[PDB]
Design a protein around this ligand. Structure first.
Ligand SMILES: NC(=O)c1ccc[n+]([C@@H]2O[C@H](COP(=O)([O-])OP(=O)(O)OC[C@H]3O[C@@H](n4cnc5c(N)ncnc54)[C@H](O)[C@@H]3O)[C@@H](O)[C@H]2O)c1
Ligand SMILES: NC(=O)c1ccc[n+]([C@@H]2O[C@H](COP(=O)([O-])OP(=O)(O)OC[C@H]3O[C@@H](n4cnc5c(N)ncnc54)[C@H](O)[C@@H]3O)[C@@H](O)[C@H]2O)c1
Ligand SMILES: NC(=O)c1ccc[n+]([C@@H]2O[C@H](COP(=O)([O-])OP(=O)(O)OC[C@H]3O[C@@H](n4cnc5c(N)ncnc54)[C@H](O)[C@@H]3O)[C@@H](O)[C@H]2O)c1
Lengths: 333, 333, 333, 333
């Protein structure tokens, strides 16, 4: 089983740690975050406004973070080249600071002894993967990879099923997306474009989504045929993809539901979900799926033009996919 | 000025009264609401969480509501049949309770002496109108009419400009829509619309939009070619239309911007607006336009497939249009 | 266990059911709610925006609501005198509609064969109880009782400990209180509680609290020496009491902490909690305590004048006390 | 009009600018911010989620910010010591960044040619003034002064009136305070103030504040007799002071209302307001008062122990007092 270091103990860093504990699929052995000391990590891991108090034990002892009795080595390095991953036994590093998303920057972790780096965001040049969609294109020569974004992990499984069965001629999508840590509590200086500095709990905010440029990398057959944007809205977690697409082969809405349900029970089980219930965003809080198709909420204008809806816990579904990708990579070693 | 009675002194009834009173296009002379007594009406009209305190005077005197010195007769009838509109001199009645939206129910106001009724919502059977789109189809034999919905009033002027210039082959739309009075503060009963009962400020909620069935009636050439749905999100006011459509004639995005800007400066001035600024929803609070095209937020996938974004103050833009529709109707008497 | 019927399957009615299942202390055998039909009850019990999806099974079968394989009789009566509690085997009825809080109205359930009634709110005339404070004043003659309110259940255990140990000369309190079902999503009619109709997600709203008139009944030595009010603020659940009191015997703040912690570990265990952690409201979501003293948040002006802070899940803590009171009542039978 | 430079174009700097233009009591001639370029300043000043779009013109021309046709010199200096206030004609400098609140640090603006510095925040060592309470203690030898905090400006005028008439023996205050820029959209790192990092729109968050202690310094006779704390709650603006105090002379609540109303109509006009209306927080958005007594929300436990409630727009009331303090200082030159 692969031993993991986490760089950036944030929303994703902490929920990747929870997912690793919940799934047992990888082992966290080290965490680096210069803004959160050991005692502070006890607090921030234990209490979570969105996902609730951790169901387990967490304490600081002998300089280590001890979760369910397992000690974790804690680093406090602002410069990732200074992190002694090898000494702590960290083989794979989750790069979840938000600020080292290029090959050049994320590769810093290789200097301290990490064997592979998984960027928890889209990358300008690291190869990007979505479990269930193109993870089989990974190979042992890729020491630096990206798990794309949470919107990309919601859109791409749904797009793949629809394209495989009916053929997407062209499509546009929107994600109605929960607020995130890059946004501001009140109108202030942005960090990525003017609209994104505006007060997050007051506003619907048009914004970019990583899926716009990533989906065509993860599904080359849809490059130039699909893109989209986001509206950030005042919820703390859970987002929803709104995919409007023209199909090559005619598809009754019942056939769409049928093939999506079949996919959710077979090859994409645990990745793509399917529901007909009268769900709202909070019903997906702490749901580990990448994408849950909402059959009741979609619209078929005609046999070749449809709107398809799919929910995703942008924090916890993505965090579980990070764990899944590392487990997959390790099985390939 | 036509003399106006307001049935239902709610978000729309009060803001219709504000719009009328400030901009004397019509004269409010009577108000009925059995759940808001006279002294309570003073308070509810004076203070408004969303649009600020009324800039003017409001008081109770001699059993009438006096706004900027003009006395208004106050009724407290549950049954519209029993409201003495004629005795109060009300010629047109705004039917803004939300529960009398059919011809049969809204026509009760004629029994008390009203001459015409304007339903502030879509109607299963009353003829529907959107200022700037089909209001010249009104004729004087229509005693009961509908002003459609706020989403219809945002979508239809934009769809008209796009269809007139390039031809909409097919389209689907979403409105990211502020919470309204039909929603609930915490998970509660909602009759047969189960998602609408879930806690409004906690969730993104898929929902119907009145635009879905109304837009094909106000633009008959688009009937069956355009529909959509809503996501209710935790903001108190201001909504945004996201229109994805295929065009018959190819159009560069700059060509779309040019015809929309031209429409906003000509025949649709005051109804359809145009901006290139980096706006978010709060920038439209108390904006009286029906539809403001957001040039920067849209996406062209190719010359025949686009996503177009348009903002609307669902409370205040619609309330101004109710006033405008009545002023137009009165001008044709 | 005593067999229980629930009148009003709302926030309290549903979480009383969850608390009963979690505790095993009582058995829900019947539920009445004319606004939630059988199939709708499945949905509202299964999905909860605040407390998450039910961890168990729930389905409708042969006209019963079946939770964890146990069937519950469902009634749909507006008028409580028509509910056949006796025939369904419901011995105690939880009166959680919010509209039958007097002895005369709540006594309707005895006509259908219920043996006792527990009003889930303060009552103008039914005896009121707070577990840990005055529950031993209950006796078998009381067929109609009240469990007071969630703020009373948070304030009264803390005031009891303070008063027993140091003597409360006089005090006033505030609860910063989550929004509830009586509030409105946007400015609307509230009846005679005018501030309570203002938009709940937009506003800090001064309001009454049931603790103001209840606390002097559950702690008679403090009647006229202690009262308070509320500010409703835009959170969906969890509230906090802010108790400012003058003490007869001087006490250092750490002396106060010691006696509260000692109370929390002894006779008030599970009712009064104690923490020194840097908590916020979400850390108490789904917490079954009546009152958790926040040692770090409070402040002393001097040895005889202090401000004491205590958290409470107003939904789930109160619901657990409703179950606890019924179990105590049943042990007295 | 004294000519004013603004250091820092955060919320306070921008709203001081708006207050100055709206009131015409001073003339803004220069703004320094090293993080916000001139085109971005146009945008942040023009659009405001909380207070609405600026009602006037704002443009970038010739390297200056031109508001209502009057050009403003823009600087971008990291080091206040290098800002050329004198060349721009700025006589008073509003020091609003938060990081130069000591006399040694704020005095850096004197080296660039400014004559006086007004710190828009509490200061360890500069003299602090609350208009209406102790501004008469200003004198022309004072080159560096502080305008205290918003909460101190709300509590102090109320405490002055209550102490002048009845004598405050001791008091404890809570402020229920809107979200501010120091908070985080989702749980994130907050240095040594752990609770302040928790998701702002999700949580009621206890927080320390020196404001009550500080009014014991601006009103020396209350030194040692006041302290308090805060709860941060999910609203974007407007806060409320909750003062529980013991009085030396007995006072009926009607006596309290009378002397507060008298003060608000006389010497504290525009600073201390008085209402009996059924107000909520949004009713004070963009209200320029420092403190508005809420007569209906307070409680008299007895003639010597009361809870007094007073509202404040923590952004705009304070910004207007900064302008008023500068106008007062200039009148004594
Ligand atoms: N829904 C989501 O939040 C989500 C989902 C998928 C991917 N992502 C992406 O994951 C990444 C992290 O997102 P997040 O929401 O967890 O942000 P976050 O702000 O919650 O976490 C970032 C963490 O990195 C720490 N950090 C900052 N600089 C550091 C440095 N030099 N070295 C080590 N640690 C540092 C921070 O202290 C913080 O704890 C981003 O790339 C983001 O866009 C976010
Ligand atoms: N954004 C909006 O809020 C919006 C926009 C456009 C159209 N509309 C439509 O306007 C109508 C009212 O919407 P609203 O948002 O103002 O709702 P609201 O709940 O704020 O107002 C409804 C008013 O009707 C009163 N009322 C209820 N029953 C009545 C009766 N028998 N007789 C007289 N008055 C009665 C109520 O007391 C209330 O004041 C609905 O049809 C709605 O879909 C709403
Ligand atoms: N935090 C809280 O929510 C809280 C805490 C303690 C006590 N309480 C009190 O509990 C009671 C219910 O509060 P709630 O928050 O659960 O409100 P709610 O609106 O969520 O629940 C009320 C339920 O009663 C149903 N109902 C209405 N009329 C009925 C009738 N004639 N017969 C049967 N059922 C009917 C409604 O359909 C609804 O499902 C109130 O008295 C309340 O003040 C609430």
């Amino acid at each position: 089983m692969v031993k993991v270091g986490v760089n950036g103990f944030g929303r994703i860093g902490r929920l990747v740690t929870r997912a690793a504990i919940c799934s047992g699929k990888v082992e966290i052995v080290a965490i680096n975050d210069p803004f959160i000391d050991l005692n502070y990590m006890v607090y921030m891991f234990q209490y979570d406004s969105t996902h609730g108090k951790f169901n387990g034990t967490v304490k600081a002892e002998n300089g280590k973070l001890v979760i369910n009795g397992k000690p974790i080595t804690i680093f406090q390095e602002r410069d990732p080249t200074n992190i002694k991953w090898g000494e702590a036994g960290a083989e794979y590093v989750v790069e979840s600071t938000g600020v080292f998303t290029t090959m050049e920057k994320a590769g810093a972790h290789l200097k301290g002894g990490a064997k592979r780096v998984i960027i928890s965001a889209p990358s300008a040049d690291a190869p990007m993967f979505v479990m269930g969609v193109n993870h089989e294109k990974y190979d042992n020569s890729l020491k630096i990879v990206s798990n794309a974004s949470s919107t990309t992990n919601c859109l791409a499984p749904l797009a793949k099923v629809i394209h495989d069965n009916f053929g997407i001629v062209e499509g546009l999508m929107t994600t109605v997306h929960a607020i995130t840590a890059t946004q501001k509590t009140v109108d202030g200086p942005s960090g990525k474009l003017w609209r994104d500095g505006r007060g997050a709990a007051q506003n619907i905010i048009p914004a970019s989504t990583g899926a716009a440029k990533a989906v065509g990398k993860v599904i080359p057959e849809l490059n130039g045929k699909l893109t989209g944007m986001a509206f950030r809205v005042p919820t703390p977690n859970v987002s929803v993809v709104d995919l409007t697409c023209r199909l090559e082969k005619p598809a009754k809405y019942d056939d769409i539901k049928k093939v999506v349900k079949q996919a959710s029970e077979g090859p994409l089980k645990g990745i793509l979900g399917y529901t007909e219930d009268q769900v709202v965003s909070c019903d997906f809080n702490s749901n580990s799926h990448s994408s849950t198709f909402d059959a009741g909420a979609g619209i078929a204008l005609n046999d070749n033009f449809v709107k398809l809806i799919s929910w995703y816990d942008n924090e916890y579904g993505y965090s579980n996919r990070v764990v899944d990708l590392m487990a997959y990579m390790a099985s390939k070693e």
